[PDB]
Amino acid sequence: GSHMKTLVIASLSGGQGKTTTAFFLGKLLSQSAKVLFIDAAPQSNLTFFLGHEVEPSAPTLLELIKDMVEPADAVYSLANSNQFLIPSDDGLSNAQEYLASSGMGAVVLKARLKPLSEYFDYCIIDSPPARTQISIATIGAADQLLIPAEASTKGVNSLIRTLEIVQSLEKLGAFTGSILGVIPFRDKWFGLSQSKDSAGAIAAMKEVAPQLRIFPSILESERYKQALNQGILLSELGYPDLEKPFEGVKEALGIKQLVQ
């Protein structure tokens, strides 16, 4: 009955908030929808944060990409009944050349996930940094692309370079989705006033890509890691305001909040 929408979190620079976004957005979406998390990063941060351990001979994203197992076999249930995961471990960097060797790497993951379409409402994919076969393949898989970008000059560059890869993949017919928007990351506020550098970076993001939605920022705050470490939502920790970047995305997806 489902028509799975694949949301890919991409940003080529390191530490731009990709995994933090995948974790919170995915948990939030799972409140009323069936969500398939995919950890596409060889460093395997999301797999760990979602509380999943990979047993020695257990099929991961690697085995799926290499078509060594059926898609449903690399899918594991999580604590929550609306949450599932295709995990990764450090061996995933081996997919790097499998993808290169195919000559169609950018559409391999896209192809591998199609059979899971009617089992889930959303697929959320956490991408690694750097331009590689894996980060290109996650982008190729996207129905909707989300780019977290640090609210700094580094983040603006990440936005720009990420958009360049999408534009190139679109030309070659691998990217057929749309760009949902940009989430500024580590936007620094001093009480009620925004830091000039953060404000300036976001303003620069809008100049770079005038057509893109800029979502509410992931504010510079230790509360995100606090909630993450406890396995809970920012709202559940008592900081609903910090959750608004993700609520904004959810609203953009046309998802209507539950009401009382």
Ligand X SMILES: Nc1ncnc2c1ncn2[C@@H]1O[C@H](COP(=O)(O)OP(=O)(O)OP(=O)(O)O)[C@@H](O)[C@H]1O
Q: Nearest approach, Cβ of 62 to ligand X (angstroms)? A: 18
Residue 222 engages a copy of itself in binding (rule: CB under 8 A): yes
By C-beta, is 47 or 152 nearer to ligand X? 152
Q: Nearest approach, Cβ of 196 to a copy of itself (angstroms)? A: 9
Choose the contact partner of 96 out of a copy of itself, ligand X, Mg ion, none; CB within 5 to 8 A by kind.
a copy of itself
Residues 4 to 33 in contact with a copy of itself, rule: CB under 8 A: 12-16, 18
What are phi and psi for residue 146, nearest 5 degrees?
-120, 125
Q: Nearest approach, Cβ of 15 to a copy of itself (angstroms)? A: 2
CA distance 13 to 37: 21
Question: By rule CB under 8 A, what count of residues binds a copy of itself?
Answer: 32
CA distance 88 to 63: 10
Check residue 22 and report its DSSP letter. Answer: H
Instruction: Give the binding site for ligand X (CB under 6 A).
Output: 11, 13-20, 41, 45, 128-129, 150, 152, 154, 186, 218-221, 224-225, 228
Stretch that binds Mg ion, among 44-52, 55-63, 73-81, 138-146 (CB under 5 A): 44-52
Of 11, 16, 19, 47, the one binding Mg ion by CB under 5 A = 19
CA distance 147 to 157: 12
Residues 106 to 165 in contact with a copy of itself, rule: CB under 8 A: 128-132, 152-154, 157-158, 160-161, 164
Of 7, 8, 12, 18, the one binding Mg ion by CB under 5 A = 18
- Check: CB of residue 121 under 8 Å from CB of residue 32: no
Residue whose CB is nearest to ligand X in the complex, by number: 14
Choose the contact partner of 93 out of Mg ion, ligand X, a copy of itself, none; CB within 5 to 8 A by kind.
a copy of itself
Dihedral sign, Cα of residue 54, residue 131, residue 5, residue 225: positive
Dihedral sign, Cα of residue 63, residue 64, residue 65, residue 67: positive
Choose the contact partner of 44 out of Mg ion, a copy of itself, ligand X, none; CB within 5 to 8 A by kind.
a copy of itself
Choose the contact partner of 221 out of ligand X, a copy of itself, Mg ion, none; CB within 5 to 8 A by kind.
ligand X
Q: Which of 216, 217, 218, 220 is nearest to 190 (CA)?
A: 220
Residue 229 engages a copy of itself in binding (rule: CB under 8 A): yes
Q: Which of 180, 179, 213, 220 is nearest to 199 (CA)?
A: 220
Helix (H) or strand (E) holding 250: helix 244-252
What are phi and psi for residue 143, nearest 5 degrees?
-80, -40
Our CA angle for 117, 131, 99, nearest 5°, is 55
CA distance 218 to 13: 17
Interface residue list for Mg ion (CB under 5 A): 18-19, 45
